Structure formats: structure tokens, C-alpha cells
Amino acid sequence: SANAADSGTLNYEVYKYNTNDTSIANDYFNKPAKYIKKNGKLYVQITVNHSHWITGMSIEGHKENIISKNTAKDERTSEFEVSKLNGKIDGKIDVYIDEKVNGKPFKYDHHYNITYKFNGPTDVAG
């Protein structure tokens, strides 16, 4: 990497809200994720698995930004702003689905949430 630092694949994960073990969202988020900074700031791009299932996501209490929605490969991405990236933050997400799962009409349309977990530097400022 050169002529464009402040960016790379940082470690990160998520967990079931109200618990401490990922139980659902963990099956739709690949890893690791790509974090990025800008002298006194930083964000992170998350990979979205199957858009037809996940309608969007939010971290720290704000919506996400469409950075790269690939419909051909069914993979979207979104950038999130958060204080550094070494712990976890209360994020949220929306979902929307409507189809028969193997002969079973499955309806889904609400605003669920999940615990985010970033893993990278911490201070690095003397």
C-alpha cells in the first residue's frame, strides 16, 4: 500500500443484540472488513450478503452510504463512521423479504438491530 494509506482490511465482527454471541447477522457479513481513517477520523466498509434479504444497515444511530451495490454478484457495501475501531457499538439495520421459502410464503419487513465489533488500533497519537 502506498500513496493512499489510512485504509486496509481491519478485524471486526457482530453479535446478537441483548446477547454476546452472533446468532443471525453473522450469517450475512463476510470478514474481515475494510477500515479507513483521515488524520483525526475513520470509517469502515461492510460487505452485504444477499441484498434481497438485508434492506440496509446503520451504526451509531445513522443510516449507511451506498458505496458499491453489486446486483450481478448479489453483494453490496456501505461505509460507516465510528469513534476509532477497537470494541463494539450499538448499530441497527432494516430488512425486507417476500417470497415462498421452498413452498413456504415467508414475510419480512421491520427494523431489527445488532451489536457491531471492530478490532484495530486504538490511539496512535503520542
Strand-pair partners of 67: none
Judge contact between 36 and 42, C-beta under 8 A. yes
CA gap 97, 90 in Å, rounded = 24
Asked if residue 23 belongs to a known ligand binding site, the reply is yes
Judge contact between 12 and 44, C-beta under 8 A. yes
Asked if residue 108 belongs to a known ligand binding site, the reply is yes
Q: Binders of ligand ZNH among 92-121, rule CB under 6 A?
A: 93, 95, 97, 106, 108, 112, 114
Q: Which residue, 98, 91, 121, 72, is CA-closest to 29? A: 91
Judged by beta carbon, residue 36 or residue 97, the one nearer ligand ZNH is 97
Interface segment toward ligand ZNH; rule CB under 6 A; list 3-11, 21-29, 60-68, 77-85: 21-29
Judge contact between 31 and 11, C-beta under 8 A. yes
Judged by beta carbon, residue 82 or residue 93, the one nearer ligand ZNH is 93
Judged by beta carbon, residue 38 or residue 104, the one nearer ligand ZNH is 104
Residues of this chain that interact with ligand ZNH (CB under 6 A) are 24-25, 28, 53-54, 93, 95, 97, 106, 108, 112, 114
List binding-site positions: 23-24, 108, 112
